[PDB]
Design a protein around this ligand. Structure first.
Ligand SMILES: [Cl-]
Ligand SMILES: [Cl-]
Ligand SMILES: [Cl-]
Ligand SMILES: [Cl-]
Lengths: 342, 342
């Protein structure tokens, strides 16, 4: 999709303090070979206190993003809140809490689930909603938020390719103006890969209690066995290349013209990494930042953009690729252009 | 919102067998005073077999709906799957499963959370997406699906105003054509009422285990005490009347020209009900059907519309009000005009 009138007006992250891989190694929680392989140096870790519940971190992130962009909360016509895991109270609309705390009473709020791609997928849904004339205002607030906890989640081991960080992020879209123009978005998808995110886990009538420790790497092995696909790996590559290709083409841009790619925090640690498939070096991606936070649920792309902007690592005229990816498997990519620094 | 080119192509519900309130009373699960007061005769209850997990019931409801409007799977550009509760496997994209089974590999799929209003709210998000030009394809598949179970959910008691039904429903939207035209949608919302959905339940870092039985009626009582609002009931009335009036006005349709209203399944049983606020007799609402299914997650409006259509209880020219409502609190309403009987 080529966007004629879509802008990023604000972006921010609210992240708890860093907790080092070295401390996790010394405490016996993380094997040192895995620490070195995955290359994650630290992750963000929240306290157990109610004030660091995911909707609260999200509300804080949202207030900062709105504040950085001079978007009046009364101009927000939609709130989308993406997440991976428990929001702290069940049978309850988290997104309305985020919306109420950061925007107000009279804005429709949805919770969104597209695993790690949530943040990126929400751009397309919200952008479309803003262009439709359904809502009053010119802006949408997009949030992410998670806080991982035992026993179900072991942040250092429960997923093979990454390590989870706690926290929240926010991005404000506008059809009027902002510091960056959204030139394009594109989504690559291959829903056959969903089996890799459930492996042979049975469909249970109720959450299994007490929760065993999640091991998403292991689901992957039994998923691959069950799916029995000749081209399993190619299916991933093809959808990622589709997203990249269409987003760059719809932006009239080439990967050589991309100052920086903000990508999900994940690392194979040998062979080809995502930057190789994207066609740019490590140094032109957000890895140097993301390896200090870990995988902050659905928020890596928002957080990494905030990072670029806060540390004046881009200037007007630069183009940035925002690059998604989540179990499903779905990947939404966007090309933005820096118009001014906030 | 007035829609110039939005149609319902197909609608269907996949529902497990009914289970009577009468039997619940004899099994000691339901107080006879409560059964009498609420007027719900039966609720749909799925087996605990894996083939009745919510995403699988949803896939079947989807295939049924796609077949009824002759929408080619290849023309669906989005899938949205709304739900209230556990989908059977955690840390896993249930929407991609629904998408893969009903539609195919290359369609973006999102899970949606807006409690009981998710099925109606989805119509607005999907309609906007279809009008935006993001996808090739002129159709969207909207699904819902839930299957409630203990210990956490007691379908007969966990919510004061209704009793939960298991099952799934699907509604296929089109910008090209359909048997019904969506004349309008409108959303009323008041996010200050989110507190009524959490009561004084603290944010917990991890789901509480073992699960206590949920009691949403008690959350509403505690939440009202905590909020200390002067105009609690007026806030509900305002947002509901807002959704009704705009939906009606944007459809250019008077209340007395609504052939039927499909509403959420609930009942106060005191002689003042939702139908009174809407300005229609009980007999022109879906209560007679609803009270045999219970509250089928986010699917009451799809399910009720399919019931009307399958039993030829409406005819071309008839305008139907689909009326949402879910904790948040958000309510999306729509006026649909029957064009043909498929
Ligand atoms: Cl490893
Ligand atoms: Cl697991
Ligand atoms: Cl009662
Ligand atoms: Cl409760």
């Amino acid at each position: 999709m080529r966007w004629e009138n879509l802008f990023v007006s604000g972006v921010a992250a609210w992240l708890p303090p860093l907790s080092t891989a070295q401390d996790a190694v010394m405490a016996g929680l993380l094997d040192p070979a895995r620490s070195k392989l995955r290359g994650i140096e630290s992750v963000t870790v929240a306290s157990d206190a109610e004030e660091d519940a995911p909707p609260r971190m999200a509300a804080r992130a949202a207030r900062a993003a709105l504040g950085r962009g001079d978007v009046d909360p009364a101009d927000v016509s939609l709130v989308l809140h993406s997440s991976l895991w428990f929001q702290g109270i069940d049978l309850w609309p988290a997104a309305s809490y985020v919306a109420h705390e950061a925007v107000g009473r009279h804005v429709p709020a949805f919770g969104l689930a597209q695993r790690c791609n949530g943040g990126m997928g929400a751009i397309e849904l919200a952008g479309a909603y803003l262009g439709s004339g359904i809502g009053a205002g010119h802006a949408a607030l997009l949030t992410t938020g998670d806080r991982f906890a035992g026993p179900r989640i072991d942040r250092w081991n429960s997923v093979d390719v990454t390590m989870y960080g706690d926290g929240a992020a926010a991005l404000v879209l506008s059809t009027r103006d902002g510091f960056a123009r959204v030139l394009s978005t594109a989504t690559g998808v291959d829903n056959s890969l969903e089996i890799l995110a459930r492996g042979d886990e049975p469909f249970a009538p109720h959450p299994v209690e007490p929760s065993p420790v999640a091991d998403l790497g292991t689901r992957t092995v039994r998923g691959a066995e069950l799916a029995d696909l000749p081209d399993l790996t190619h299916r991933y590559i093809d959808l990622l290349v589709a997203a990249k290709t269409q987003a760059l083409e719809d932006a009239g841009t080439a990967i050589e013209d991309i100052a920086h790619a903000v990508i999900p925090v994940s690392r194979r640690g040998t062979g080809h990494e995502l930057h190789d498939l994207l066609g740019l070096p490590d140094e032109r991606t957000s890895w140097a930042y993301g390896r200090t936070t870990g995988h902050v649920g659905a928020g890596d792309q928002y957080a990494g953009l905030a990072h670029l902007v806060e540390n004046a690592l881009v200037q007007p005229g630069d183009r940035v690729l925002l690059f998604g990816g989540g179990a499903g498997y779905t990947c939404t990519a966007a090309v933005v252009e820096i118009l001014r620094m906030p």
